[PDB]
Amino acid sequence: ACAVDAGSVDQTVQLGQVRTASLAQEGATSSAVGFNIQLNDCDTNVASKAAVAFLGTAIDAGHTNVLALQSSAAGSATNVGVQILDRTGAALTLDGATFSSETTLNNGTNTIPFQARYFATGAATPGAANADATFKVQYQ
Amino acid sequence: GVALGATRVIYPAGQKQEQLAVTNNDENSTYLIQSWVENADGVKDGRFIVTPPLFAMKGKKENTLRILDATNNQLPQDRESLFWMNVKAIPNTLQLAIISRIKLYYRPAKLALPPDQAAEKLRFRRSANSLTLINPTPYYLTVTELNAGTRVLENALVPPMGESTVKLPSDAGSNITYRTINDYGALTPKMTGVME
Amino acid sequence: SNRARGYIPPELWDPGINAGLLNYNFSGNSVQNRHYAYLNLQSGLNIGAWRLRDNTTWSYNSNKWQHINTWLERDIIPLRSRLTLGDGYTQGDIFDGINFRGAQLASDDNMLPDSQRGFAPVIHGIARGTAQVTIKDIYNSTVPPGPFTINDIYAAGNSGDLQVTIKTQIFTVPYSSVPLLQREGHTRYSITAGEYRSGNAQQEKPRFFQSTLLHGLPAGWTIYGGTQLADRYRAFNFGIGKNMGALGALSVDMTQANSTLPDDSQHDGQSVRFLYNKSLNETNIQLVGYRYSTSGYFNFADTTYSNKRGKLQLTVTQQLGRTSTLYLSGSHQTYWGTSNVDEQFQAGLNTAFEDINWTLSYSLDQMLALNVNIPFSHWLRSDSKSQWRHASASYSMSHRMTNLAGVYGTLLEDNNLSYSVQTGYAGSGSTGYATLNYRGGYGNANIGYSHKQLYYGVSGGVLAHANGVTLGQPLNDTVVLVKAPGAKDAKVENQTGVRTDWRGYAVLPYATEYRENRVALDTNTLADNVDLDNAVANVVPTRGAIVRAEFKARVGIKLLMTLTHNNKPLPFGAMVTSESSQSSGIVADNGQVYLSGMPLAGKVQVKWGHCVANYQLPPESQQQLLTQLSAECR
Amino acid sequence: TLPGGNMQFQGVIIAETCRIEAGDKQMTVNMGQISDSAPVPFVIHLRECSTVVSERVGVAFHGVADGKNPDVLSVTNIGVALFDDEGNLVPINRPPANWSTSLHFIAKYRNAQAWFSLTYQ
């Protein structure tokens, strides 16, 4: 019934600058940047709940819940990754079949917010940090 | 303690001002911060102004230093220029005043070679007991990890369009490896030396 | 008592300010086939510490004001929890997530420091003498002789083995992770009372009680219990989870439910949920979630009307070449009575080498997809300032065939104007898409043309605080109200299109709650005539708190003054004050003092430990960025 | 169940200078009264920075020079001499010479302030 908002298909989110002080050892985090997935022309009768599934490359086997960083000729960061959190503050895995917190769909424009941040899987080395993940919207 | 936001500051020509952060995370120390800028030789010069030149910080706090240009377009537009930014944090007995020096790269707009590719274009010349680094790139090169076989050499800084000489032991290996530091303060992966 | 890494005393948390909050979101869809108006309005009042929130919807086809939620949430620091009165929802980690209207008292994980989140075994034991105990380097410090309880181990998920070296008994602490596990000495509780609310009109509205408890016993054990009582449904859930270290982690819970059907018939049932997370092998991470529901087992959702024989989920992830991520997922559901079985298998291979990001996915009817993402930054030099560098190409092919090739990125100075033009083809339908999103300092406006559909939407927020009304981007829970009077058009940092208006008040839509966040005003894009006393502040807001970060700005022209007393530069540390604009400063060196916000003509007062210096400036100095004058003091 | 699209995250990471934390409170090394002399040790800790950045740090001393000897800090007819852990004299007002995250220095008689300069390569 509903259709994902056009423009939300191709979305770019800027995390700003994070100094290496905030990423000391494994488990350290950084500031969070808000973003959302828009939904328009939703019919609640056909589907009443919505969920989002994220699919993306993992930085390492033991940290599948953290994205991987693309190599850059200018020098990308090392042992750092991108972490995605739902509205409940819980980390989301990137296995491709883990639906986030199901949210009740409403008639009209629907917004499902999420958060992104930097997760240090090791010693932090400066450089560019470019990542990308494929998100899937599921209707119930 | 006092801490600088970045290790080196890139100042693009044409931009009015630049920003740099100064942080302190010791909630029980009073710090008088003083700032200034000196030329390549370490002599105080008025070509750059830091605002505020001096102020006071108490508790866990950070301030924003603003760097203003005053060269008034009296510098070349074909090569980068070097300056030294100095930040001092003033707290019988001896008092320890900590002064930190960081690099300031004044970078013109028009440039043929992007900064990333400058590292791979460095050239070497092996003399009898010294090594000379020919750098026809328009960027300052901060060469470290200058390893010569089983003998490691001293780090060096080569200005653009120039050559710098470093000592060379006779037992140093034939192959030479070096690394370059980018604008973010990270070591470029090891690269071999292209002898001419 | 060692404080946890990242702990802030609760007295440093700002409850907020007395303010009215409004969040409007209007959308208009004009579809011309060879008009729908939706409006979502969130009203709110932050009086004292409570947070009154209300949601309203209005629609128009080409008037129906419909309420959605009205709730008063509050934070209780002594109970380390939050209280929700009104229409809310229950997470239901062990039970089923349900919406309701009533009183919910729930513990919160965010209020704890980031160190004490997730699962990480705590290190006990005694170190002889002064030992610099080292954990492989998550933690590195010493400890006085005697028993020590290291509990600052960060949540690292599966990971590997933590080597503990005392300085020398060397013992390792391998550990696994299950979401249902808890740390040692950690208690999570959730009490919910009130009526049940559901979207379906057919379902009844009974009053219910729910209790959920999660306790972390020592040595990697977790005991979790739950009780769901109602007029017709009575269930008790008991579960145990164990960390076996190298072997893995286990969680098993049984729920006994006496449930009454829509008919008067009464049924009894038991359900066993078994969850197993394999440790790291070789590389490969496996999650096995099984649920066996015997005949006669029902949930509270089925009880409030007017079975599942078994469920099996198996997820295997393997990383190869540090680039490719094999994702296998299998779901298999049986049924009671009906012998039909629902199966779903999904296998994906995602690889991102250099800048190219290519993903090939397969799913079972079957569906295969290939996605290629290529940022334009690969080809053109990053030195060039052409806006086209902030663009990327997406090429997708889905097998019916669906091809979609598009360019997308930003082309404005502040990366506010997000543009996306994507041609497509379905096999023969040619339905291209084009969208322009603008995120400015007065609201977000998104307009889209789809080959015909025309979307136009505006989202914004109104804050009625003490110092007037401030308009800004749509508000997301905690909002930071930045107040810098006299500084018009000052862009904040680490956010896109969040600018101060002529009043000088702006709003940061998002700031992490119970955490230290930096609010900085970028002086680079700020007017020369205005100077900020402090361009950075730090605030730690609470859930739904409007915290104010104050920055004082001097509006007069900046000025550097060379002061000499008795033909000699003023001594270091001399205080220079100016009552003309209430400005202050300290002499830096060589009798030079910097002063922000000074009038054209005035007199400054100097205190070495009492002198007056008159000064006047020609109007030409006002047009100059930084003026320097020399004024001998009396 | 329909595909959503791609979502890109972009940012940059920058290093930072090593913070200086002298052992004594407020960086005030108490020496004592005078009737070389008894050694007075002071420690410096370079904290919150990567090892590579910390390694490439040039440490130097400079300050007020005594009239009798420009290589000793001015304070009667005495001065403060600074020695490294190895005990060799480190002259004041000298070019940097790279010397891990914990520095140790000794002061001896033979108040004042000593500009302690850390250049970051």
Residue numbers in the entry:
A (entry chain A): 20 to 159
B (entry chain C): 1 to 91, 101 to 205
C (entry chain D): 121 to 154, 160 to 187, 196 to 269, 274 to 304, 310 to 424, 427 to 450, 479 to 536, 546 to 580, ...
D (entry chain I): 7 to 41, 51 to 90, 98 to 121, 128 to 138, 150 to 160
Which lines from the publication concern this structure?
To explore the structural implications of FimI-mediated termination of pilus assembly, we performed a FimD-catalyzed assembly reaction of pilus rods in vitro similar to the one for the FimDHGFAnC complex, except that excess FimICHis was also added at the end of the reaction. Given the low FimI concentrations in the periplasm (FimA:FimI ratio ≥100:1), we focused our analysis on physiological pilus complexes with a single terminal FimI subunit capped by FimCHis. A 3D reconstruction of the FimDHGFAnICHis complex at 6.4 Å resolution was generated (Map XIV). However, multi-body refinement with blush regularization in RELION-5.033,34 improved the resolution to 4.0 Å for the pilus rod (map XV) and 4.3 Å for the FimI-bound assembly platform (map XVI). The resulting composite model shows that the FimI-terminated pilus rod sits on top of the assembly platform at an angle of about 48°, similar to that observed for the FimDHGFAnC complex. In addition, the comparison of the complexes with and without FimI showed that the subunit in the usher pore and the FimC-complemented subunit on the periplasmic side occupy nearly the same positions when the two structures are aligned based on the transmembrane and plug domains of the usher (RMSD = 0.56 Å). The overall conformation of the usher also remains unchanged between the FimA and the FimI-bound states. In contrast to the major conformational changes observed in early steps of pilus assembly after plug domain displacement, no major conformational changes were detected in the transmembrane domain of FimD upon incorporation of FimI. We then aligned the FimDHGFAnICHis complex (model XVI) to the previously crystallized FimAICHis complex (PDB-ID 6SWH20) via FimC to assess structural differences. The angle between FimA and FimI differed: in the isolated FimAICHis complex, which is not restrained by FimD, FimI adopts a slightly different angle that would cause a clash with the transmembrane domain of FimD.
Uropathogenic Escherichia coli strains use filamentous type 1 pili to adhere to and invade uroepithelial cells. The pilus consists of a flexible tip fibrillum, formed by the adhesin FimH and the subunits FimG and FimF. The pilus rod is a helical assembly of up to 3000 copies of the main subunit FimA, terminated by a single copy of the subunit FimI that anchors the rod to the assembly platform FimD in the outer membrane. The assembly platform FimD in the outer membrane of uropathogenic E. coli is the catalyst of type 1 pilus assembly.
